[PDB]
């Protein structure tokens, strides 16, 4: 119990980008709530996913 509503931590957010961009034919919002939350914070982190993991 933590996110499941609006946002989450940058560490688990990276895992979301790996399971949301890997599937080329699945929904972005559906995949988000599938293991985390709606397409609210997962939609913005899906476009700049490389910008958040740029430091590495």
From Swiss-Prot:
It is found in: Nucleus; Chromosome, Centromere. Residues 2-52 form the HTH psq-type domain. The modification N,N,N-trimethylglycine is found at residue 2. The modification N-methylglycine is found at residue 2. Changing residue 4 to Q: Abolishes N-terminal methylation. Poly-ADP-ribosylated by PARP1. N-terminally methylated by METTL11A/NTM1. Alpha-N-methylation is stimulated in response to extracellular stimuli, including increased cell density and heat shock, and seems to facilitate binding to CENP-B boxes. Chromatin-bound CENP-B is primarily trimethylated. The modification N,N-dimethylglycine is found at residue 2. It comes from the Eukaryota. Residues 28-48 bind DNA. Interacts with centromeric heterochromatin in chromosomes and binds to a specific 17 bp subset of alphoid satellite DNA, called the CENP-B box. May organize arrays of centromere satellite DNA into a higher-order structure which then directs centromere formation and kinetochore assembly in mammalian chromosomes. Antiparallel homodimer. Interacts with CENPT. Identified in a centromere complex containing histones H2A, H2B and H4, and at least CENPA, CENPB, CENPC, CENPT, CENPN, HJURP, SUPT16H, SSRP1 and RSF1. This is Major centromere autoantigen B. It comes from Homo sapiens (Human). The gene is CENPB. The chain holds residues 1 to 56 of 599 of the full protein.
């Amino acid at each position: 119990m933590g996110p499941k509503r609006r946002q989450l931590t940058f560490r688990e957010k990276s895992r979301i980008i790996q399971e949301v961009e890997e599937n080329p034919d699945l929904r972005k919002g559906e995949i988000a709530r599938r293991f985390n939350i709606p397409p609210s914070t997962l939609s913005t982190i899906l476009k700049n996913k490389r910008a958040i993991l740029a430091s590495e």
